[PDB]
Structure formats: C-alpha cells, structure tokens
Amino acid sequence: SSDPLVVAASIIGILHLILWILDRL
Amino acid sequence: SSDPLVVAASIIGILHLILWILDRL
Amino acid sequence: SSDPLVVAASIIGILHLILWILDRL
Amino acid sequence: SSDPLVVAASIIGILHLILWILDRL
Numbered sequence: 001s002s003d004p005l006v007v008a009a010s011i012i013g014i015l016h017l018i019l020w021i022l023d024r025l
Numbered sequence: 026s027s028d029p030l031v032v033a034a035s036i037i038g039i040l041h042l043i044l045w046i047l048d049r050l
Numbered sequence: 051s052s053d054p055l056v057v058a059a060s061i062i063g064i065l066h067l068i069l070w071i072l073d074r075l
Numbered sequence: 076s077s078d079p080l081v082v083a084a085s086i087i088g089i090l091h092l093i094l095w096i097l098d099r100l
C-alpha cells in the first residue's frame with residue numbers, strides 16, 4: 001500500500017498517458 | 026504510506042502538471 | 051512495498067522514458 | 076516505505092526534471 005497522494009498521482013499520470021495517446025491517434 | 030522521497034516526487038509531478046495546464050490556458 | 055497500481059505506474063513511466071530515448075537515438 | 080522499483084522510478088523522474096530545467100536555462 002501507498003500514501004493516498006501517491007495513488008492519486010499514479011492515476012493522474014496513467015490517465016495523462018492515455019489521453020496523449022488517444023489524441024495522437 | 027510511502028517513502029518520503031516518493032511522496033515528494035508525486036507532489037512535484039502533480040504541480041508540474043498543474044503549472045503546464047495554467048501556462049497553456 | 052507499494053499499492054499494485056503505483057508499481058504499475060512506475061513500470062509504465064520507466065518504459066516510457068526508455069522508449070523515448072531509443073526513439074531519439 | 077515503498078517498493079524499491081517505485082523509489083527508483085521517483086529518483087529517475089526527479090532527475091529527469093532537473094536535467095530538463097538545467098538544459099533550458
């Protein structure tokens with residue numbers, strides 16, 4: 001388990017990646 | 026909970042995101 | 051130890067870095 | 076505390092940031 005702030009940051013980072021890929025495609 | 030260095034990195038990453046968005050807007 | 055979602059995000063981030071470097075080289 | 080892989084990723088991310096800033100300055 002991780003600090004909730006670290007979980008939140010990981011979620012935001014993954015979604016940032018996903019949105020960038022979808023934008024480029 | 027997380028290593029303090031990982032918490033710090035998550036904070037910096039989130040703030041980096043926020044600043045980028047504000048700059049673009 | 052960390053939340054599995056945080057481990058996954060860290061792996062994805064490292065691989066993202068690696069792929070970017072290989073692309074540029 | 077965090078998984079060692081997550082600590083490593085956080086270190087790499089911070090250093091990536093630092094190098095980018097120094098390059099731009």
Ligand SMILES: CCCCCCCC/C=C/CCCCCCCC(=O)OC[C@@H](O)CO
Nearest residue numbers: 003004005008009012015016019039042043
């Ligand atoms: C990038 C596409 C998605 C939009 C993302 C835009 C950025 C939004 C960022 C929001 C930050 C919310 C983070 C919320 C973090 C909450 C921290 C908390 O309540 O617990 C503190 C712990 O440290 C105590 O153990």
Ligand SMILES: CCCCCCCC/C=C/CCCCCCCC(=O)OC[C@@H](O)CO
Nearest residue numbers: 028029030033034037040041044089092093
């Ligand atoms: C990007 C906009 C905001 C400016 C950010 C610029 C980058 C600044 C980076 C500073 C790095 C500070 C990290 C500080 C990390 C401290 C680590 C610590 O004291 O505990 C070590 C643990 O591993 C032991 O359990």
Ligand SMILES: CCCCCCCC/C=C/CCCCCCCC(=O)OC[C@@H](O)CO
Nearest residue numbers: 014017018053054055058059062065066069
């Ligand atoms: C960027 C080059 C590599 C391609 C990456 C493309 C992005 C793929 C992202 C996939 C996200 C998979 C994350 C999978 C995360 C699973 C979370 C889980 O099962 O446990 C939940 C815990 O919170 C409970 O403790």
Ligand SMILES: CCCCCCCC/C=C/CCCCCCCC(=O)OC[C@@H](O)CO
Nearest residue numbers: 064067068078079080083084087090091094
């Ligand atoms: C970007 C400027 C700095 C150069 C960075 C270039 C990228 C180098 C990346 C290297 C990845 C090394 C990560 C090393 C991670 C080791 C994982 C480990 O041994 O423990 C596994 C745990 O999950 C078990 O609990």
Ligand SMILES: [Ca+2]
Nearest residue numbers: 003004005026
């Ligand atoms: Ca906390």
Ligand SMILES: [Ca+2]
Nearest residue numbers: 028029030076
């Ligand atoms: Ca430590």
Ligand SMILES: [Ca+2]
Nearest residue numbers: 001053054055
């Ligand atoms: Ca969990």
Ligand SMILES: [Ca+2]
Nearest residue numbers: 001026051076
């Ligand atoms: Ca932990």
Ligand SMILES: [Ca+2]
Nearest residue numbers: 051078079080
């Ligand atoms: Ca492990």
Ligand SMILES: [Cl-]
Nearest residue numbers: 002027052077
């Ligand atoms: Cl963590």
